[PDB]
Amino acid sequence: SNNSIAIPTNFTISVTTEILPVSMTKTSVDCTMYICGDSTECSNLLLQYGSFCTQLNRALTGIAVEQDKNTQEVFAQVKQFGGFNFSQILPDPSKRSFIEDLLFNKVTLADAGFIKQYGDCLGDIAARDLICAQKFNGLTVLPPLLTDEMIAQYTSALLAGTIQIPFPMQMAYRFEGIGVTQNVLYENQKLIANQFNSAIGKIQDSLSSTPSALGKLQDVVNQNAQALNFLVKQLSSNCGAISSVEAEVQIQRLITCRLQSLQTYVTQMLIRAAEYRASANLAATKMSECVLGQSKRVDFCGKGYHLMSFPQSAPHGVVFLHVTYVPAQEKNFTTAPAICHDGKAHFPREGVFVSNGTHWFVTQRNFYEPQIITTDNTFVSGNCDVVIGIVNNTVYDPLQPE
Amino acid sequence: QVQLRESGPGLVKPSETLSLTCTVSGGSTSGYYWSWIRQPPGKGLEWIGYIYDIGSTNYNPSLKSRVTISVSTSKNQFSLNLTSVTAADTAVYYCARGFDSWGQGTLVTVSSASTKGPSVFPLAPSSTAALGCLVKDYFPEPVTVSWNSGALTSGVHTFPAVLQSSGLYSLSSVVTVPSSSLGTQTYICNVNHKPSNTKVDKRV
């Protein structure tokens, strides 16, 4: 390249969906009910066989506090409009938005077995946990430390990036962080608002009817529900629970088979907990530097240069709406360092001289906003003969009186 | 309880592919994690990868570019395939369910040699006395030596195989018998070598 510069001309602001699971449901096995459920001889059953229940329940308590730590690391980073729409993404007073309830209604149908049955038999009363574990073979689902109300409140707190600076000035400052001046936003605000609103309309159409983006959240919750239902299936159809109905060998083969099924459940839940921890670490990284700050990385928060992001609280997950800036229609323009006029060399004050073929303009380096060459845009230093790649043009003085 | 049994080729040439299958009897590949974990002889364990039934294929980020693990439509099998197998990939491959209930390993040698069958020779007593049988000149190492078709199990010592100067293995299996029943019982040794498909029963 001798004298040529590649400059973008058009731009598209686009939103993208990033769904990351951050929490697994809590399971706890109540001892002295899993073993000797209805044998009514719970001394000799809990002596030889009852010491292996607490070993598994310790691991379930460990993965439960690990998932609570995951939700605390993701959703609790902080403690506490214009031409854009923002009506479907903000809370509308049960303190949830219109993307949040679509996510909740689509993801809560991924479970249809043990968890929904426990929620139905709970009766919205937390004092019946001794009763609800009696009829479901001793398996209990603990509620999380951070409830749905607190997660929704923390999401509403983290949605303070839409703030005492007004929102168009914030978008202008984020464009200035990208590398384009504020005149591009303030002169193309209607097109940007239309693209953002149409992108929210497309995200609502593509999140609800088709699965589309909900293929990495529905399947992991479905895997968790199937792993819990297979425990009840292999606890009821074969190796059944102790009911009212020499024979120590039979009760030994019933109490050893039901323990091994639980050990299978813990062993294949620990790997799922590791995968959820990796996803939660990715979510904490994507909320530390895409939310609560513009990111300098490329193609990490979203496709193109990252501009903004909004968090949303999905059940057992987090939904990031990434707002990004995609350049398009690159053009090759002819560059020149300085311009000679009246025997005086003029250098650009802030920008690059460009030529589109016939006329000469002063533009920014990262965008094609043509400005006519005046004396308020160039400064004078040196003579004509010293600059190597000089070009002939006329600088237009704004003072042209009668 | 579940049972995991591994099977596949015992010897592959270099720049070929492995195809190791794992039969699951007593359970189904429907909602559990399954992994392959290998072991070089006299070394530690190395992990290849684990899969789920519907998806979630995670492999090792040192061997990812030449590995694939796949479930089967029979609902009781899954297979491991490797690509561009060098001489450093010979191992006792293990098939496991997550990280619990492992299976017996299958040894996969990788060298450009030929499947040479065994040759059992007797080792008679020379007047408790010891009697045995010797196996010579066989290239792979799965070989199994049993005594009296699984009836004589006490006092059996099956020595590890040694590599000779000819590039072929040799082995010995010696059992001790009381002198009051030196010749009052029929003692035979049964060998079995699977790549050569050879079963020799030898008296003593």
Next chain:
Amino acid sequence: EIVLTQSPGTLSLSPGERATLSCRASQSVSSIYLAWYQQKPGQAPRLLIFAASSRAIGIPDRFSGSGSGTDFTLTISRLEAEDFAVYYCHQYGSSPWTFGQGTKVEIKRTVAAPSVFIFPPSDEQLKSGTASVVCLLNNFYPREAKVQWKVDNALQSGNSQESVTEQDSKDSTYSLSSTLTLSKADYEKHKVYACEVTHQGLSSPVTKSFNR
């Protein structure tokens, strides 16, 4: 990768004592993402302790796990002779699951003298043309046993090859097989052959000699 290192690489403990094995990780892994395995010779690994201290089913109260962070301990109390194994520590927390080099646990008992046997070549390998003479040391402790061959009272080297078994589970004894392989032409040129052994449990070297 998180490299897991075990510092007591090989122990030698009498029955009734304690065994403390340490696994150290380069990065801080959590308390719930480590496991322990024992491996008998020629068998599959068996899970012993998953998470930090959660025992599996079918395992006695001897094996107890402890630790969190970058220092994990496995404790064997009232060790028996059926614990001759290689012990491994495993991480299932990070995506590249990493094992470690194992700790080989041996059992120590009193000195037992070897019983020495000689096996001549049979007629089958005489017909084939390669003679192989076997010297057998049946049950002996410790592993340090010296075996040598004498052909017409001349010491031989570079032809014998040894194989030593692992320890038996019921009693802590070894076994040794020395194979002397040579040609039929060299076997036809000598009359007396002998296997001579020396060991700590033998006051004098033991010679077992044979002819055709």
